[model samples]
Target chain A: PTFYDIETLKVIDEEWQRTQCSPRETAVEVASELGKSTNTFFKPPCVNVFRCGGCCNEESLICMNTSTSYISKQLFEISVPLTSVPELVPVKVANHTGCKCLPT
Target chain B: PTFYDIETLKVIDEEWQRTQCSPRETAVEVASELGKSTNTFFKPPCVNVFRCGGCCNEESLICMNTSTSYISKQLFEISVPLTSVPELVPVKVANHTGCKCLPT
Candidate 1:
């Protein structure tokens, strides 16, 4: 059996449940903003990002991404500052879609 | 200690040692040729392909690729046939460069 500290006791008192390693679609903001505020590059306000989370049997194993999803995003130039690289920057993001427990 | 059968004894006689999961550079021929012999598209005769191999002790685990290398290849056209898709076909190949033990 596992002993618990006061913090753990509080968690057990409120939510008596266990969890396993899995993927979750969590709302994530890639970044707040980039470049100067005056010439800020446009980024998505928010994206439903799929990510891996949770515990793996409380063992010395960690969850590793087994599958992945991706989103094509573009950062539009807000102000065509003369020192601009391109009109739009195309980016591909790796969104974790699945995971598996593995020894770390 | 461990006992061995005739096959295992033969292996022991030839090469007696232990092994671990690791990556190796092995000569691999992707394919001999594509298209018809008369109008064959050229493929690299052979490439030094990096691959993962070896055992992870006597455990229920497997070796997984942790790192990778890539090579840019192209299929050269021998005879410009009318059915040719393009003048040159670009291809990218993943070459395993590193490996690590992981739970199966």
Candidate 2:
């Protein structure tokens, strides 16, 4: 349960609820706006979460650091199962060590 | 845990995990393949769930029939909040009547 200083967050919820029922229509609109083919537009390859508390609630610890990378991959694969990446290029992992003074 | 007759499902897990860390790279590849802008390639509008036990596990009953539509919409809004749909043409709902189902 969070309170926002402004009503921006509230609008987000309102807009999202509005789109759920019309996924196809929404896809079409997004495609048209982007000037891309339906196939390409409808299948987005990435979606970044702020890693904050709204969707990733503390209670739903499922989206924790350890599990989220896996979940993101899972979401992509499950949604577009048939689609394949060209030649399976492996991504390199970044190492960020020793930062104790950063404020939480 | 589900067991597919073939090892296809396991591969899905493997591939998805691979892509999670490389959302931007994956997006770039998808765009390049389809000849679309990076922005267009990154934002998918529709992602259908088979509505079974895997991601929407019984324990995480959050993705119920009632809630999923909302979740989908929320996902769209949160990811691309500033993005707008053409006006707000309200979508009409189709009412389903009398379905006692022959089998589960």
Candidate 3:
């Protein structure tokens, strides 16, 4: 039997129901569920932003780590086998790494 | 001056002009530009899809690695300082990881 079955996806769907539908959380859960089913691993990439002489000192460079936040709360619901997934689809997403200046 | 500025972003914009606007390419260029600006690194996460007993076999599980394609061709144009980037922005994108059945 294939690891990704209707039952397994349903379990993932249920887990998604509990989230505020955050992208990072959703991605983590989905990746985690897939991992458990296939004994593999998955993860979303961390987004980093760098600022120079903004909030920090005029000569200091600061870095910030952020999450790739999704604008859509909807999950990927696949009911049919994909012949070929679309190359382009509309999505709302962003990675906001809230970074602040360190107190001088 | 901050690493991300009108002039720096304009250079990134010019790089984006060269692509057919493929998401992976655009993302790579943007990330690369940011990397050069701050001497840091950036990358998009790889998306993997697993299929069971569909194309590969009735009993075999298959995995596919796909690029996160973008539906939008426009690059990020930052003209003003953002107090807080939007939490949710409408975007068009998809990851079409093409996987098929192995020869029987």
- Colliding pairs, model 2: none
Chain B vs. true chain B: TM-score per candidate: 0.52, 0.19, 0.21
DockQ of each: 0.01, 0.05, 0.02
Instruction: Give the lowest summed-lDDT range of ten residues in model 3 chain A.
Output: A42-51
* Candidate 2 TM-score, true structure as reference: 0.16
- Give the least accurate 10-residue stretch of model 2 chain A, judged by summed lDDT: A21-30
Which sequence of candidate numbers ranks them by DockQ, best first?
2, 3, 1
- Per-candidate TM-scores read 0.31, 0.16, 0.18
- Candidate 2 positional error at B93, Å: 25
What would the per-residue lDDT of candidate 1 be over residues B1-104, giving only the tens digit for each residue? 25645554454323212234566544333333233465443333233456675555334567789998786544344444546353445545568988987887
Backbone clash total, candidate 3: 5
Best by TM-score: 1
How many clashing pairs per prediction, in order? 0, 0, 5
Q: What's the residue-level lDDT of A69 in candidate 3?
A: 41
Tens digits of per-residue lDDT for model 2 on A46-95?
Answer: 22222211111121232122222211222221222335552322222222
Residue range B1-104, candidate 3, lDDT tens digits: 57655665464334323221122211112322222343322111111122121111222333233333434322223322333332222223344434333433
